[PDB]
Amino acid sequence: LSLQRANVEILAVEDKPSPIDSGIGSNGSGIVAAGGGSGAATFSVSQASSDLGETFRGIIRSQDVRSTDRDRVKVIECFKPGDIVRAQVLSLGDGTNYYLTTARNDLGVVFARAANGAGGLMYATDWQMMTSPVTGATEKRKCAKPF
Amino acid sequence: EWAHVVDNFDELIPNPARSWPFELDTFQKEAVYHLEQGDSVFVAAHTSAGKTVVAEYAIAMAHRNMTKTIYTSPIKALSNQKFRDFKETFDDVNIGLITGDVQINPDANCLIMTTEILRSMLYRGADLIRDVEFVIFDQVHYVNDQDRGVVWEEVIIMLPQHVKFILLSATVPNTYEFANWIGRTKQKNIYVISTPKRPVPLEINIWAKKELIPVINQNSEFLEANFRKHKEILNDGPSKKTWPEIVNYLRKRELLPMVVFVFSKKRCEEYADWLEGINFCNNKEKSQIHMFIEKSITRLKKEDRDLPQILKTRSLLERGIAVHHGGLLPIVKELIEILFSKGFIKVLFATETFAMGLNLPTRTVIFSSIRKHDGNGLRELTPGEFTQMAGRAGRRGLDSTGTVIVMAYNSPLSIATFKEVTMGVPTRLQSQFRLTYNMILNLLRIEALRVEEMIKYLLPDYEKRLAVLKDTEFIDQNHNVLLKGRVACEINSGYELVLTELILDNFLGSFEPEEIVALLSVFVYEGKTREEEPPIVTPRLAKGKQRIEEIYKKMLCVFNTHQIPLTQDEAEFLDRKRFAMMNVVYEWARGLSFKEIMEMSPEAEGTVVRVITWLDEICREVKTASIIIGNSTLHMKMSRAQELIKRDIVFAASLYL
Amino acid sequence: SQIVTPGELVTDDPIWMRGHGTYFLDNMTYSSVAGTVSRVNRLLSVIPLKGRYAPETGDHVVGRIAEVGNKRWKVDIGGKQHAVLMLGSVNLPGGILRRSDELQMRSFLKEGDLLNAEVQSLFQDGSASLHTRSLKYGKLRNGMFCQVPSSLIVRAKNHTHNLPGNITVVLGVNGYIWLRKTSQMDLARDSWQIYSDENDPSISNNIRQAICRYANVIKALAFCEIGITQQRIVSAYEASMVYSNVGELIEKNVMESIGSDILTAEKM
Amino acid sequence: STFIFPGDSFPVDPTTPVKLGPGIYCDPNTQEIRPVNTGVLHVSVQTAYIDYSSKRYIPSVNDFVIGVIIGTFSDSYKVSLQNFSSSVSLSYMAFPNASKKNRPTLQVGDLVYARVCTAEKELEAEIECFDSTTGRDAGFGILEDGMIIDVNLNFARQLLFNNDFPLLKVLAAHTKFEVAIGLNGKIWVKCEELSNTLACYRTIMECCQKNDTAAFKDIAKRQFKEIL
Ligand SMILES: Nc1ncnc2c1ncn2[C@@H]1O[C@H](COP(=O)(O)OP(=O)(O)OP(=O)(O)O)[C@@H](O)[C@H]1O
């Protein structure tokens, strides 16, 4: 997150996982990122497209978070790192990132955790609120409409 | 796609967006009704008729519809005043300001900016334009200039199709053409609304020998018998017992609020000083004014509040007397304006700039004389200027009529000149389209673009100027720009050829940054004073004076060899004393309290700050020329000079914010 | 003039002001390149014998789109750096602020396209800024591309010429050349389709043959190191009609003969 | 008052509310208060925290720091507070009497004295060159010339906040000097002569290498005699 945009990684394209193999277990024990092991420094750049576990990347600009009042949007009051967000593609962008938008009632946060990913799951309560069931604490999000 | 001229409201608009505690005029109702239908409106009504009601209603409509509004004025002076007025008037609407100096609340729903700011914003393609519903142009009749004309037309052309327009101005001969052009270019319906007459009437009087003679009534009908009696009773300039003879006659008539127009910076101070033993504050107004002044000037540094101008203004303001001219600091000028707007000043001596813009009306307007000196000799006032000055005399509601007094100083005035000045159709101004060497050099670098065929839609002059440029090796025989011409293309202010010759002659290579900026003030200060120059400057900075004068003299001989007509500024260059400000600039850069500087400077505090401000552009141009020729020694010298002439007082915040 | 080499003393007079191509120590001035000494009033500088094209304000250039960026394009014009073309410096068919065109810039210009532009201003380091705000500039079509060194392009006031055989040539200052079929705008010189990739569907064989011959004679002129002008191009085209086959103009002896004939005819 | 280890029992009554300071963690799953650092636990509306030894700085609001300009952007500077750490940002409007015409004139490589104003967990920290809480401008801005000294965090805290720490008093008895103290582990000094600045640098380095505050005077005397 920053003050101007949010960076995401694409996990599924129309209810189909992308890629099929996520690379889990390729780096051994512990909790490691896909490119955080020993094989990342010995990948053959000139004989393949990308390395094991690489995904498409996207960018959500603050002016694309919603369709109205798109000059007073606070990014940290909408998303947090680690959230699962449903978005729609606007443009192919450059070779690094797509461009995405959430400016519709069915787009936004679908899964989130309390304490910035250290706690349990929360459930959506209002258009701009989620609630923790174990302790009745509330946080601000841009909730995608359920049901 | 057409312009329409127009000349059951309660049922038509049962739910108005805003309400006022008075009955609206017909033109206001028409403007409101046509704004409620979704059409653009052109309003051309007389002064002090209530044009700002339309803008307030537009802002209220935008707030109700949750859209944005942009307000634009040609003059940056009016932006701050309108910002303060709108901030006071509206409490539920966020107000913002965007100028070349400040930027407050860019995300607000109501924005006030300048035309060039909007031009740059449109060029950048800002995202806030998509939400804009109304754009308001105030004081349209002041945009008929050359520099103000192109930007306005470009802004009008570049605007998108979902933006509606509101236009406000005065009664001018060219009114239907602007609306027709806008409605043709944008293919929108716009209605032209005009008012019959002034809501408050004005009268013209003549003062002679301790009484006032009404000579024109409220119907603009001349009275010959009164003028004849004025001629009979009188059978030069003001005396030391003249302004007291007027400040008491009008005081007893309950017509006290007075604005006197004197066409001289120095004469206003003398006239104000001649008023001795006159007061208007009894015991509490003085204390309130003292508190306001003390709080306002807190933003300055402690040693900058002792300047003689501030002390004199404070002493005068405690009695209800003030002056308004271009020789004051901006803070003092805006302080005087704010105090005048609060009804604390009774007598004001003002220059011509007060009438232009500066929405601060009064009750009485007195003309010291009907003639003024504008550059080249004396000239009787044009009817347009007289109408502009005299029109600021009747405030709606608080006044039943507007009084105007024309003085007569122990000498009768001709009646034909009076009739010509007061009665007559005003004429729109025009420009002679001066041709400069920078324009010619810039046009020669453009691929294709046959120059001669565009000048027609000046030709004998263009050929003569090309011969000069080829003689001094700015261009070659095929009219290709050389290295010398490229430098001159980047110098815009006043003197391209003389400055270029100076730079390429290894001048400025021996002096220090403090001395370089001191010598360059000759191109900024016009030397209209007559006071003695400093007899001693330094052993150096006097050789620099001789070198500049010799180079200018050599360039002047080349101009006369080719028989080129010369402007007044260029002809009388060495005749004026344009080197008088070297010492002031030299000590400013060296580091010296601005109070000690004013003890020896030949110009007021307001003039000194203007000179330093104009010297910022000169340093930028010389820095650019150093990159073109590849002299890094000159580049670092000019960078140091810029940092040496910056002080806190030149960046003082406005009192309107 | 005088030929100097790097590290050579030019003058020891403490009266000159130093310019490009030199460095100094106290009153001694030295050369940093191989070139010729130039004097303008009190300014002293050295002009290099070889170098890349250096853009100047007002230049007429031909370039290729290299990168599609954030509200800007990168254009290759053969200099030391890429030029910059802002999105606000071009003309859009529909408009700029319609209630897109920032995320859809590839619908107008994309990587590999050739275009015609003018230099608007120079940045601090010499890189150029381009604009396409006239009907005479834009996308190039209906012809062929060729390249010559920029030092062989003679400076002139006009850079677009109509040639016999219904052919038009665009002579770039940077040395990039475009040959095409003459259009209505070219004849008149003497909305949404301005970004189209389609060529004219009625280009005949005679025009193709003429374009081939013009390219061959331009390459022949460049081989002999003769400056390229419109008059020389026409003269070389007319003098090559002896050979009936265009393909015989690629031999070295024919190119040298054409160049020598042009020079001899001019010198007479 | 007592020495504590991570995983130890927390000696505070669960009924009384206590505000938590550094070194103490509240579990997001079990809502349990436990210590995570090793050191001395101080208990003062009462506040508890653990004093532990550290060298790597982590930004916190209302801290006085010294930074280096490493890059200039369109609207702000890029500032480094420690080698190999994530950078912070300093805005062009974070100077006194700042406007779009009164731009700052700092370059890449300058030293600055500032205050931490924003330290959000999900964002990049921000600094300002004036105390916005009080409107005071006490020493914030560029530091010209001088020399920079690296120390650990406890030493910097002792210098800045403890008035009974005797180093500044013993230094003032040898020379006149200027000083700025940053809680990120930086000290800036300057004297009129280079030899005095060098002696101050050597004295500060040697005093930081030691732990006994009673030997500062002898160290200062020996170092100032060394430079003759
Ligand atoms: N219909 C009205 N009835 C009574 N008072 C009115 C009416 N309309 C406006 N006013 C009053 O006029 C006063 C000022 O008028 P206003 O400033 O709008 O004149 P103006 O035409 O804008 O002058 P300028 O030529 O300088 O732009 C306002 O304070 C307002 O109260």
Swiss-Prot record, chain A:
Q: Which GO terms describe its cellular component?
A: cytoplasm; cytoplasmic exosome (RNase complex); exosome (RNase complex); nuclear exosome (RNase complex); nucleolus; nucleus
| Source superkingdom | Eukaryota
The molecular function terms of the Gene Ontology recorded here are: RNA binding
Q: Which GO terms describe its biological process?
A: exonucleolytic trimming to generate mature 3'-end of 5.8S rRNA from tricistronic rRNA transcript (SSU-rRNA, 5.8S rRNA, LSU-rRNA); mRNA processing; nuclear polyadenylation-dependent rRNA catabolic process; nuclear-transcribed mRNA catabolic process; nuclear-transcribed mRNA catabolic process, non-stop decay; RNA catabolic process; RNA processing; TRAMP-dependent tRNA surveillance pathway
**The entry's keywords:** Cytoplasm, Exosome, Nucleus, Phosphoprotein, RNA-binding, rRNA processing
Q: Where in the cell is it found?
A: Cytoplasm; Nucleus, Nucleolus
Q: Which residues form the signal peptide?
A: none
Q: How does it assemble?
A: Component of the RNA exosome complex. Specifically part of the catalytically inactive RNA exosome core complex (Exo-9) which may associate with the catalytic subunits RRP6 and DIS3 in cytoplasmic- and nuclear-specific RNA exosome complex forms. Exo-9 is formed by a hexameric base ring of RNase PH domain-containing subunits and a cap ring consisting of CSL4, RRP4 and RRP40.
Any extra remark in the record?
Present with 5550 molecules/cell in log phase SD medium.
Family membership noted in the UniProt record: Belongs to the CSL4 family.
Specify the protein name.
Exosome complex component CSL4
- Which organism does this sequence originate in? Saccharomyces cerevisiae (strain ATCC 204508 / S288c)
Swiss-Prot record, chain B:
For the Helicase ATP-binding domain, which residue ranges apply?
A: 32-190
The organism sits in which domain of life?
Answer: Eukaryota
Q: Where is the Helicase C-terminal domain?
A: 267-444
**Could you tell me the keywords of this UniProt record?**
Antiviral defense, ATP-binding, Cytoplasm, DNA-binding, Helicase, Hydrolase, Nucleotide-binding, Phosphoprotein, RNA-binding, Translation regulation
Quaternary structure, from the entry: Component of the SKI complex composed of at least SKI2, SKI3 and SKI8. The SKI complex interacts with SKI7, which makes the link between the SKI complex and the exosome in order to perform mRNA degradation.
Q: What is its main location?
A: cytoplasm
Protein family per UniProt: Belongs to the helicase family. SKI2 subfamily.
Range of the intact protein held here: 301 to 828 of 1287
What Gene Ontology terms for biological process does this UniProt record contain? defense response to virus; mRNA catabolic process; nuclear-transcribed mRNA catabolic process; nuclear-transcribed mRNA catabolic process, 3'-5' exonucleolytic nonsense-mediated decay; nuclear-transcribed mRNA catabolic process, non-stop decay; regulation of translation
Q: Where is this motif: DEVH box?
A: 138-141
Name-wise, this protein is Antiviral helicase SKI2
Q: What else is known?
A: Present with 5770 molecules/cell in log phase SD medium.
Q: Which GO terms describe its cellular component?
A: cytoplasm; Ski complex
**Keyword RNA-binding (UniProt):** yes
Amino-acid biosynthesis is among the record's keywords: no
Protein species of origin: Saccharomyces cerevisiae (strain ATCC 204508 / S288c) (Baker's yeast)
The Gene Ontology terms for molecular function here are:
ATP binding; ATP hydrolysis activity; DNA binding; mRNA binding; RNA helicase activity
Tell where it localizes: Cytoplasm
Curated annotation (Swiss-Prot), chain C:
List locations, semicolon-separated: Cytoplasm; Nucleus, Nucleolus
More details: Present with 4840 molecules/cell in log phase SD medium.
| Spans traversing the lipid bilayer | none
Give the keywords, sorted.
Acetylation, Cytoplasm, Exosome, Nucleus, Phosphoprotein, RNA-binding, rRNA processing
- Domain S1 motif per the UniProt entry, residue ranges: 56-133
**In Gene Ontology terms, what is a biological process of this protein?**
CUT catabolic process
Mind telling me what this protein is named? Answer: Exosome complex component RRP4
Per the entry, what this protein does is: Non-catalytic component of the RNA exosome complex which has 3'->5' exoribonuclease activity and participates in a multitude of cellular RNA processing and degradation events. In the nucleus, the RNA exosome complex is involved in proper maturation of stable RNA species such as rRNA, snRNA and snoRNA, in the elimination of RNA processing by-products and non-coding 'pervasive' transcripts, such as antisense RNA species and cryptic unstable transcripts (CUTs), and of mRNAs with processing defects, thereby limiting or excluding their export to the cytoplasm.
GO molecular-function terms, A-Z: RNA binding
| Organism domain of life | Eukaryota
Q: Which GO terms describe its cellular component?
A: cytoplasmic exosome (RNase complex); exosome (RNase complex); nuclear exosome (RNase complex); nucleolus; nucleus
Q: Which residues of the full protein are shown?
A: 52 to 354 of 359
Query: What family is it from?
Result: Belongs to the RRP4 family.
Swiss-Prot record, chain D:
What species is this protein from?
A: Saccharomyces cerevisiae (strain ATCC 204508 / S288c)
Question: What is the role of this chain?
Answer: Non-catalytic component of the RNA exosome complex which has 3'->5' exoribonuclease activity and participates in a multitude of cellular RNA processing and degradation events. In the nucleus, the RNA exosome complex is involved in proper maturation of stable RNA species such as rRNA, snRNA and snoRNA, in the elimination of RNA processing by-products and non-coding 'pervasive' transcripts, such as antisense RNA species and cryptic unstable transcripts (CUTs), and of mRNAs with processing defects, thereby limiting or excluding their export to the cytoplasm.
Name the gene that codes for it: RRP40
Q: Which family does it belong to?
A: Belongs to the RRP40 family.
Name of the protein described by the UniProt record: Exosome complex component RRP40
Which residues belong to any copy of the S1 motif domain? 60-130
What Pfam family is a match, any one? Rrp40_N
- Gene Ontology MF annotations: manganese ion binding; RNA binding
Question: Other remarks?
Answer: Present with 6050 molecules/cell in log phase SD medium.
Record-annotated disulphide pairs:
none
- Quote the InterPro entries the UniProt record gives: Exosome_RNA_bind1/RRP40/RRP4 (IPR026699), KH_dom_type_1 (IPR004088), KH_dom_type_1_sf (IPR036612), NA-bd_OB-fold (IPR012340), RRP40_KH-I (IPR049469), Rrp40_N_euk (IPR041054), Rrp40_S1 (IPR037319)
SUPFAM superfamilies noted in UniProt: Eukaryotic type KH-domain (KH-domain type I) (SSF54791), Nucleic acid-binding proteins (SSF50249)
